[PDB]
Write a protein that binds this ligand. Structure first.
Ligand SMILES: COc1cc2ncnc(Nc3ccc(F)c(Cl)c3)c2cc1OCCCN1CCOCC1
Ligand code: NA
Length: 297
């Protein structure tokens, strides 16, 4: 019986003249640039993302990204209507967390790993409060603002649940199989609890310092592996306490898996005694970051 409330997010349309590209970051192509609005004496570092069937997907993505506002989720600064539609967002200078953990494998300690798990769970809990199923959570879709501050991005697959709707039922469409809950593979059902499965895989990627899950197994074999009860193995650095959390994320009964709000509590506790839980060897004047550039709502 609960109804739906209005979404009064403001979609800001940026003029192409207001921002300068600088370099490519990966060709979907994403550029790094500088946005210099109105007559404001500020310069904001941005990332800039860019056949009729595809502009619909980029506008669904802009819709979601314009509707989120949390320190651990990436939000839209605005869109630019060129030949192709561009999404403009805060530059996350250290890039994606997957690459970051691979590049700094030898220097990442237990405090960082556990704090990232907390922050990812915070962002995901926020998305859950907004009734959004992300559907593509993975370390490649977490971005690094600084080593101490990460945010979830890439809302290309995300879906808004009705006020009294548990599930999104997908049609066909490519979905990254190695991060998907078993029920999503077999039945195309997605929920907040399927996102929790992906979260566990994401934690595993972190705790192996960026290993590929089920490395060298074809995606078409993953369903039958999971059905037999096999799961990703215990990373070497992980105590049983940390692995148990991961394993719980990969239970067959979706409602048995932890909730994001529980994951925040559990990883917060572990971050206070990090070496109890992970055993790890060797443990421009007018530039404004977009977190200090506030746009009325
Ligand atoms: C400094 O690097 C980035 C900062 C970023 N800052 C903000 N957003 C990014 N991506 C992004 C993601 C979704 C969006 F809607 C928009 Cl507008 C942008 C960013 C992507 C970035 O790089 C993506 C790097 C992808 N690597 C680069 C090549 O190696 C494999 C994948
Ligand atoms: Na230690």
């Amino acid at each position: 019986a609960m109804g739906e409330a209005p979404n009064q997010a403001l979609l800001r349309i940026l003029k192409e003249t207001e921002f300068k590209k600088i370099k490519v970051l990966g060709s979907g192509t994403v550029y790094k640039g500088l946005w210099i609005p109105e007559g404001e004496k500020v310069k904001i570092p941005v990332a800039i993302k860019e056949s009729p069937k595809a502009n619909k997907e980029i506008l669904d993505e802009a819709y979601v990204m314009a509707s989120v506002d949390n320190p651990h989720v990436c939000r839209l600064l605005g869109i630019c209507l060129t030949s192709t539609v561009q999404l403009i967002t805060q530059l996350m200078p250290f890039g994606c967390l997957l690459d970051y953990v691979r590049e700094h494998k030898d220097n990442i300690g237990s405090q960082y790993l556990l704090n990232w798990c907390v922050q990812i769970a915070k962002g995901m809990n926020y998305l859950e409060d907004r009734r959004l199923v992300h559907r593509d959570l993975a370390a490649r879709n977490v971005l690094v603002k600084t080593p101490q501050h990460v945010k979830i991005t890439d809302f290309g697959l995300a879906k808004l649940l009705g006020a009294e709707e548990k599930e999104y039922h997908a049609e066909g469409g490519k979905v990254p199989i190695k991060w998907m809950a078993l029920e999503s593979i077999l039945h195309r059902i997605y929920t907040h609890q399927s996102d929790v499965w992906s979260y566990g895989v994401t934690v595993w990627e972190l705790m192996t310092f960026g290993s590929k899950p089920y490395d060298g197994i074809p995606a078409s074999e993953i369903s039958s592996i999971l059905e037999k009860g096999e799961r990703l193995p215990q990373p070497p650095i992980c105590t049983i306490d940390v692995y148990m959390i991961m394993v719980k994320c990969w239970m067959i009964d979706a409602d048995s898996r932890p909730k994001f709000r529980e994951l925040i509590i559990e990883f917060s506790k572990m971050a206070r005694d990090p070496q109890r839980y992970l055993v790890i060897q060797g443990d421009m004047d007018d530039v404004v970051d977009a977190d200090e550039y506030l746009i009325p709502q």
